[PDB]
Swiss-Prot record:
Expressed in macrophages. A glycoprotein 3 binds at residues 29-30, 41, 52, 126-130, 165. ADP-ribosyltransferase that mediates mono-ADP-ribosylation of glutamate residues on target proteins. In contrast to PARP1 and PARP2, it is not able to mediate poly-ADP-ribosylation. Has been shown to catalyze the mono-ADP-ribosylation of STAT1 at 'Glu-657' and 'Glu-705', thus decreasing STAT1 phosphorylation which negatively regulates pro-inflammatory cytokine production in macrophages in response to IFNG stimulation. Signal peptide: none annotated. Belongs to the ARTD/PARP family. Auto-ADP-ribosylated. This is Protein mono-ADP-ribosyltransferase PARP14. It is found in: Nucleus; Cytoplasm. Interacts with STAT6. Interacts with PARP10. Interacts with PARP9 in IFNG-stimulated macrophages; the interaction prevents PARP14-mediated STAT1 and STAT6 ADP-riboslylation. The chain holds residues 1208 to 1388 of 1801 of the full protein. Induction: Up-regulated by IFNG in macrophages. Down-regulated by IL4 in macrophages. Residues 10-181 form the Macro domain.
Amino acid sequence: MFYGTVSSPDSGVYEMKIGSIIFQVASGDITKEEADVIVNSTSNSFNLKAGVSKAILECAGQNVERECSQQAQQRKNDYIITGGGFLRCKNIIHVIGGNDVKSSVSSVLQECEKKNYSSICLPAIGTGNAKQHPDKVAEAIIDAIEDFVQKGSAQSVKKVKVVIFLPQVLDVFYANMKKREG
Ligand SMILES: COc1cc(N2CCOCC2)ccc1N
Ligand SMILES: [Cl-]
Ligand SMILES: [Cl-]
């Protein structure tokens, strides 16, 4: 039904269409990317600084750190939205690494439509301190995008890119894409 063909447009980058959306994967430092939204994978307190969350909070800066802890105290949040600080994005969406990854990605997609955003960059959510298994994480991320497309919800969102710190986790995402391709 929805899946196009897997190819490599640039060195180390792999992509396929899912309906109208270009889905891409690559290995690297997510804090060097430009996108409307960058996703952080963090703790239920939104103040973790290990792995991806270390890089994101250090580069984003202290105002973003402060924003996170202020929203954390205000209410019980499944995720929070902050400014981009000194990252190259309009907003950071901080999701809980231990939560259901499909649900987290669905929420990111819906929040990006609400802002008329076109591009998203996320890590392999949950594979860091939360210690979720890489193939379950890959299956969940791609399933969330498929569901969003199937329901006719894609309008402003055009590009979803996963930038993955460990090259061995990239392998797992590529194999999952190949399983689905048309
Ligand atoms: C940016 O996210 C990560 C970082 C690291 N490491 C930091 C550098 O030294 C040790 C590995 C390992 C896994 C992830 N996801
Ligand atoms: Cl994590
Ligand atoms: Cl990663």
